[PDB]
Amino acid sequence: FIMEFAENLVLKLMEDPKERDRRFREHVYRVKDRCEKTKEMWSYPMRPYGFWTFERHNSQLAWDAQISQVPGRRDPYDDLLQHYS
Amino acid sequence: GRKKGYVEFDESPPDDFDPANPYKDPVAMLEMREYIVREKWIQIEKAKIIREKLRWCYRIEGVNHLQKCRHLVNQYLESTRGIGWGKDGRHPSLHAP
Numbered sequence: 001f002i003m004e005f006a007e008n009l010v011l012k013l014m015e016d017p018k019e020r021d022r023r024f025r026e027h028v029y030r031v032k033d034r035c036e037k038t039k040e041m042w043s044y045p046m047r048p049y050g051f052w053t054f055e056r057h058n059s060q061l062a063w064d065a066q067i068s069q070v071p072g073r074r075d076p077y078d079d080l081l082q083h084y085s
Numbered sequence: 086g087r088k089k090g091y092v093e094f095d096e097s098p099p100d101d102f103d104p105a106n107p108y109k110d111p112v113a114m115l116e117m118r119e120y121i122v123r124e125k126w127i128q129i130e131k132a133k134i135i136r137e138k139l140r141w142c143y144r145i146e147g148v149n150h151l152q153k154c155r156h157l158v159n160q161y162l163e164s165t166r167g168i169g170w171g172k173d174g175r176h177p178s179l180h181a182p
Contacts, residue, residue, distance in 0.1 A: 012086040017093070025112050032111060 094123060125170070132164040 051057055067073070099116035107114055139161050142154035166182055169175070 007090070011088070011090065014087045016087060028112050028115075 095120075125168075128164075129168050132161065132168055135161045135164050 048054075071079070098120055099113055101110060102113040102117050103109055107117065135157070139154060139157040142157050143150050146153040162179065166180060169180070172180055
């Protein structure tokens with residue numbers, strides 16, 4: 001009965017071939033999906049397309065529109081007309 | 086844990102495998118390679134069985150072994166035609182169809 005117990009213990013050891021194959025397939029599919037995702041992540045250029053339209057990059061326009069009435073940068077005719085009216 | 090100690094494989098090529106583009110699906114590629122290995126091993130074992138029966142024919146038949154085991158010799162020599170994986174040094178007269 002010692003050999004029978006040893007065989008049962010060895011069978012309790014090892015791994016289920018069905019579970020091993022399923023895990024292998026799942027792991028390979030996951031790696032393939034993630035690697036194509038990382039390749040498309042790397043494919044993007046460093047300079048974005050819309051960077052010239054971004055609000056953060058176009059920060060001078062708002063400030064200068066706010067500050068356009070300061071005497072240091074006024075159009076002379078604007079000052080003339082505001083004096084006239 | 087394993088259920089019982091006897092091998093369970095399928096005697097059919099894995100599906101979703103494209104011979105034109107075998108490298109498109111990695112799982113299909115690897116399973117097809119494993120199936121090809123299994124088929125080659127089956128052919129090798131068939132040749133080994135033929136070789137064993139040939140050797141026992143040669144042992145049982147004495148001086149008159151050239152005509153009694155001629156069919157077994159021919160069967161073994163045709164069965165060993167495409168056994169190997171890298172036996173390209175073997176002459177094509179015995180290793181090529």
